[PDB]
Amino acid sequence: MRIVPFGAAREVTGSAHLLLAGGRRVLLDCGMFQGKEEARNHAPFGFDPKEVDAVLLTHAHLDHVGRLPKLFREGYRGPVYATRATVLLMEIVLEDALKVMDEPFFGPEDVEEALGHLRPLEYGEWLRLGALSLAFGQAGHLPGSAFVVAQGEGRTLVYSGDLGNREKDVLPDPSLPPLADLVLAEGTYGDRPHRPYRETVREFLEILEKTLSQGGKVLIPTFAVERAQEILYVLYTHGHRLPRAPIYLDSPMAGRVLSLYPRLVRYFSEEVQAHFLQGKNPFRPAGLEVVEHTEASKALNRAPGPMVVLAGSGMLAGGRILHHLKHGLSDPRNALVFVGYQPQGGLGAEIIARPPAVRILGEEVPLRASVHTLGGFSGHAGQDELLDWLQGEPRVVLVVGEEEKLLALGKLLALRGQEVSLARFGEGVPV
């Protein structure tokens, strides 16, 4: 038994790892490369898709599912297991990827073909292929998120996928992994832990209080898959002490996802499940409004506050949020609140730099609006949490993250007495 990395090796995008054991060949995740590496999506998988017996999916994010349609595109026709949640979320996610995609590497034909082979698999359910036994573990990174426990040949392998940030309240706690012979783990935040959730929420409400009372606009760039609605959960549960203001979820995508949430109750925390039981939907705070078209979205640019606005892209790589910033950043009474990680060398980091003005949609705009960075809202397990999850495991191979982060995590693991290595593309590791 051995696992072969085929993405997310000394990098963060591209998750896909071939499991070779018991004459069977299981594909663990199959995501697209993003950012600067985006062209690699056109390159070859590094293995014959046609020779895959089955593929498992940890969660619906593009960086872990994005290259599945390409897998079918080239022949593969086996089953693709995932949680109901991961399945339903994937449809929304992929149809959007198709639509919002400059240079395609797969077609609509490849999409339904892929969606068509998806087969449900829930936490604690065991799959069997030859002597190989597979099952999903609770990851708490998204609804339906999970880590893979592969067991066979007298060995045991644990694949982490993306471990969530246990401190938040929407998803349930990640599960400790079973003691394994080998753990293929992520390290997005191998260098540092996040600011505590609790105090992050507090600082969050603080910002809203001040901004909303002076009739300002609270701008919140956000991803449409889970971050957008988690922010709406906070609003929903602290909305009793917040000044009245319309809440605009300026992202059709984010809405579709929201609509789907009620159908996913089981996948959330006991707290979130308790609300749904009282007949209420904690993802819909008062005055919530989902903006469908550009016309209304642009009117919000020139609409006096107070108002809370949410829009993507979450990395500010484009989207309606730019238009909101282009017209809301020069008023000191408004507040920009980053709730997601901002890549370096981007407008995000650039804005946090705090120059006198910034370029947006071809126009240097004075930066007076106050800026904030609430990292406590990260959906990834921080370094302290990483060390916890990984505790006790004899051997660990690192994926997902930048060399440095992974090395930082590595060093700590090593000094702890654990064996470790950063995965390499192609170079398999013995389970």
Report yes or no: 177 and 137 within 8 Å, Cβ to Cβ.
Answer: yes
The residues with which 422 forms a beta bridge, in sequence order, are 398
Give the per-residue contact string, 103-142, with Zn ion (x = CB under 5 A; - = no): ----------------------------------------
Query: Of 58-66, 149-157, 254-262, 312-320, which part binds Zn ion (CB under 5 A)?
Result: 58-66
How many CA atoms are closer than 13 Å to the CA of 187, on its beta-carbon side? 32
CA 71, distance to chain mean position in Å, is 21
Nearer to Zn ion, 156 or 188 (CB): 188
Q: What is the DSSP letter of 403?
A: H
Taking the complex as a whole, the smallest distance from the CB of residue 240 to Zn ion amounts, in Å, to 32
Task: Decide if residue 162 touches Zn ion (CB under 5 A).
Answer: yes
Taking the complex as a whole, the smallest distance from the CB of residue 313 to Zn ion amounts, in Å, to 16
Angle at the Cα of 150 from the Cα atoms of 145 and 155, rounded to 5 degrees:
150
Task: Decide if residue 226 touches Zn ion (CB under 5 A).
Answer: no
**From CA 316, how far away is CA 358, in angstroms rounded?**
13
Nearer to Zn ion, 165 or 373 (CB): 165
Q: How many residues does the chain have?
A: 431
Neighbours of 77 (CB within 10 A): 12
φ/ψ of 282, rounded to 5, equals -65, 5
Taking the complex as a whole, the smallest distance from the CB of residue 186 to Zn ion amounts, in Å, to 9
Taking the complex as a whole, the smallest distance from the CB of residue 160 to Zn ion amounts, in Å, to 11
φ/ψ of 268, rounded to 5, equals -90, 180
Nearer to Zn ion, 62 or 157 (CB): 62
Taking the complex as a whole, the smallest distance from the CB of residue 295 to Zn ion amounts, in Å, to 33
Nearer to Zn ion, 142 or 247 (CB): 142
Per CB under 5 A, contacts with Zn ion among 319-348 are none
Number of residues forming the site for Zn ion (CB under 5 A):
2
* Residue type for position 247: I
Buried/exposed code over 374-411 (b: 16+ C-beta within 10 A; e: otherwise): bbbbbbbbbbebbbebbeebebbbbbbbeeebbbbbbe
Taking the complex as a whole, the smallest distance from the CB of residue 34 to Zn ion amounts, in Å, to 11
Query: Of 161-169, 223-231, 271-279, 304-312, which part binds Zn ion (CB under 5 A)?
Result: 161-169
Nearer to Zn ion, 17 or 61 (CB): 61
Task: Decide if residue 380 touches Zn ion (CB under 5 A).
Answer: no
What is the secondary structure of 147-173 as a DSSP string?
EEEEEETTEEEEE------TTSSSSPP
Q: For Zn ion, which residue has the nearest CB?
A: 61
Question: What Å distances lie between residue 50 and 3, 25, 55, 133, 151, CA to CA?
Answer: 18, 10, 12, 21, 23
Query: Of 35-43, 57-65, 246-254, 334-342, which part binds Zn ion (CB under 5 A)?
Result: 57-65
Cα Rg for the chain, rounded, in angstroms? Answer: 22
Helix, strand, coil fractions of the chain, as percent rounded to 5: 35, 20, 45
What is the secondary structure of 77-110 as a DSSP string?
---EEE-HHHHHHHHHHHHHHHHT-SS-SS-HHH
Q: Which of 61, 194, 320, 395 binds Zn ion (CB under 5 A)?
A: 61
Taking the complex as a whole, the smallest distance from the CB of residue 305 to Zn ion amounts, in Å, to 33
**From CA 396, how far away is CA 403, in angstroms rounded?**
15
Query: Of 6-14, 61-69, 321-329, 399-407, which part binds Zn ion (CB under 5 A)?
Result: 61-69
The overall longest dimension of the chain from CA atoms, in Å, is 66
* Helix, strand, or coil (residue 231): helix
Query: Of 1-9, 158-166, 286-294, 401-409, which part binds Zn ion (CB under 5 A)?
Result: 158-166
Query: Of 54-62, 73-81, 203-211, 367-375, which part binds Zn ion (CB under 5 A)?
Result: 54-62
Nearer to Zn ion, 4 or 142 (CB): 142
Taking the complex as a whole, the smallest distance from the CB of residue 61 to Zn ion amounts, in Å, to 4
Nearer to Zn ion, 89 or 336 (CB): 89
Give the per-residue contact string, 279-318, with Zn ion (x = CB under 5 A; - = no): ----------------------------------------
Taking the complex as a whole, the smallest distance from the CB of residue 59 to Zn ion amounts, in Å, to 6
Which residues contact Zn ion (rule: CB under 5 A)?
A: 61, 162
